[PDB]
Design a protein around this ligand. Structure first.
Ligand SMILES: O=C(O)CCCC[C@@H]1SC[C@@H]2NC(=O)N[C@@H]21
Ligand SMILES: O=C(O)CCCC[C@@H]1SC[C@@H]2NC(=O)N[C@@H]21
Lengths: 121, 121
């Protein structure tokens, strides 16, 4: 049951920093939906943000720009990951992210691991 | 130092590996176009692959699924990066990338840096 199995479904996922995204995969592989950041010590929290990417086979890549006309953290994030089933029936998306912002001293780029865990209705 | 200044413009970018991308940035700051991989020791080379993400201000994040109806590397790369003016009034995109794939051993993710330089026609 790897990514093809989400052709035309909403699915919600949640990471270890509390951030929650709901992604809409279409038959052609295209990902869209909203990302809600709750990672401590960060901006643009508790508000949904347009994400967009593309899943195929066992891999998904997706991107959030942290601007939505409500709060603008002047920065963008992209995740790349692989779907992985968990002991008991569950599934995760293990990912690496990169985060580009620009401040006073010019541009910076943080990177980290993010493991998203399927949540059911 | 602004992707906002790239609206309804198609623009070509190369990086230190010689990979090339043409990106189209709509009025809404949304991003589309082709990526051509040229990285030695990788798959899926010299063929265009769709890319998509969003640009706002001096930050962009975009994503490529490495399947295009020609060659399937069964992997997905996502970049996030800022715009950085160069001497001579040039513009470059500094970027951090994550490439996720399923190999014999299961599920790996590699990361790394990539600088893309604007090439006018
Ligand atoms: O600081 C900002 O510019 C706002 C966005 C912060 C989001 C980062 S993306 C990496 C990490 N994982 C999350 O879910 N949130 C933080
Ligand atoms: O290896 C694969 O499965 C497909 C090719 C990946 C190309 C990578 S993406 C990261 C780096 N940046 C490039 O311009 N090319 C390589």
């Amino acid at each position: 049951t790897d990514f093809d199995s989400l052709s035309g479904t909403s699915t919600t996922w949640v990471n270890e920093l509390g951030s929650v995204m709901t992604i809409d995969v279409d038959r052609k592989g295209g990902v869209t939906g909203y990302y809600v950041n709750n990672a401590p010590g960060t901006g643009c929290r508790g508000l949904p943000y347009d994400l967009s990417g593309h899943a195929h086979g066992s891999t998904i890549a997706f991107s959030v720009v942290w601007s939505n006309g409500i709060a603008d953290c002047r920065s963008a994030t992209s995740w790349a990951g692989y779907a992985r089933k968990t002991f008991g029936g569950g599934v995760q998306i293990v990912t690496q992210w990169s985060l580009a912002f620009v401040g006073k001293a010019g541009g910076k780029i943080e990177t980290g691991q993010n493991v998203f865990t399927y949540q059911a209705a």
